[PDB]
Amino acid sequence: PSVFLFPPKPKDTLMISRTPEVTCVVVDVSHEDPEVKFNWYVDGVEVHNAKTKPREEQYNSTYRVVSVLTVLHQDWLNGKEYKCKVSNKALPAPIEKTISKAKGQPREPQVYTLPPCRDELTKNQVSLWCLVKGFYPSDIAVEWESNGQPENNYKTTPPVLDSDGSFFLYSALTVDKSRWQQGNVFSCSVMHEALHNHYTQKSLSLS
């Protein structure tokens, strides 16, 4: 019997409209000891509002049991610790698992847009670049758009630890050449806790 504790998504913690949840997942729950019990704590204080989905037996004849705790957005952003305690008569001692936001002072992202270079314009497609650096923690969200509408053909690298302890990434949005020299303006939305309104936006166009 194994337990896995998953954090909220970054977008969910950064917008009061959305619902951030911590998710405790238990797998390899045998048939001879099926019942599972979750105890939740935030900063060592037990909470009772979690919601434990009914068990679902997998195609390997073991059960998957999930427990979802909704967190207050500013609790997570203030680094409370969420502890999932899982109890099962199969186990000798119950399994504890703790998750939190990374410790460390938040640092504002620097969002630099970058046009293609001289030598990619031979091809039909064109990559426009969005450099985001110097942020902490690595929880962040990056989206692209133009004309007030989302772009789908973008890929974003994982956050990468920099020399100075912050993080950086790049987002590359690839569009048609004819879209870019028409002179459509493309924009790089970035969501991170250390930005004002948790949001910023940098636009890009030929000139």
Ligand X SMILES: *[C@@H]1O[C@H](CO[C@@H]2O[C@@H](C)[C@@H](O)[C@@H](O)[C@@H]2O)[C@@H](O[C@@H]2O[C@H](CO)[C@@H](O[C@@H]3O[C@H](CO[C@H]4O[C@H](CO)[C@@H](O)[C@H](O)[C@@H]4O[C@@H]4O[C@H](CO)[C@@H](O[C@@H]5O[C@H](CO)[C@H](O)[C@H](O)[C@H]5O)[C@H](O)[C@H]4NC(C)=O)[C@@H](O)[C@H](O[C@H]4O[C@H](CO)[C@@H](O)[C@H](O)[C@@H]4O[C@@H]4O[C@H](CO)[C@@H](O)[C@H](O)[C@H]4NC(C)=O)[C@@H]3O)[C@H](O)[C@H]2NC(C)=O)[C@H](O)[C@H]1NC(C)=O
Ligand Y SMILES: *[C@@H]1O[C@H](CO)[C@@H](O[C@@H]2O[C@H](CO)[C@@H](O[C@@H]3O[C@H](CO[C@H]4O[C@H](CO)[C@@H](O)[C@H](O)[C@@H]4O[C@@H]4O[C@H](CO)[C@@H](O[C@@H]5O[C@H](CO)[C@H](O)[C@H](O)[C@H]5O)[C@H](O)[C@H]4NC(C)=O)[C@@H](O)[C@H](O[C@H]4O[C@H](CO)[C@@H](O)[C@H](O)[C@@H]4O)[C@@H]3O)[C@H](O)[C@H]2NC(C)=O)[C@H](O)[C@H]1NC(C)=O
- Residues in touch with ligand Y (CB under 6 A): 2, 4, 6-9, 12, 21-23, 25, 58, 60, 62-63
Using rule CB under 8 A, residue 179 touches a copy of itself: no
What phi, psi does 109 have (nearest 5°)?
Answer: -70, 145
SS3 percent helix, strand, coil of the chain, rounded to 5, is 10, 50, 40
Least Å from the CB of residue 15 to ligand Y = 13
Using rule CB under 8 A, residue 203 touches a copy of itself: no
82-94 core/surface letters (b: 16 or more CB in 10 A; e: else): bbbbbebeeeeee
Using rule CB under 6 A, residue 100 touches ligand X: no
Per-position x/- string for 23-42, each x denoting binding to ligand X as judged by CB under 6 A, each - no binding: x-x-xx--------------
Q: Which strands make up the sheet holding 45-47, listed edge to edge?
A: 45-47, 36-42, 82-88, 95-99
Using rule CB under 6 A, residue 81 touches ligand X: no
CB of 109 within 8 A of CB of 87? no
CB of 12 within 8 A of CB of 65? no
Q: How far apart are CA 169 and CA 161, in angstroms?
A: 9
Q: CA nearest 24: which of 47, 1, 7?
A: 7
Q: Return the residues of window 103-162 that contact a copy of itself according to CB under 8 A.
A: 110, 112-117, 119-120, 123, 127, 129, 131, 133, 153, 155-158, 160-162
Site of interaction with ligand X (CB under 6 A): 2, 4, 6, 8-9, 12, 21-23, 25, 27-28, 58-60, 62, 64
Site of interaction with a copy of itself (CB under 8 A): 110, 112-117, 119-120, 123, 127, 129, 131, 133, 153, 155-158, 160-163, 168-170, 172, 174, 202
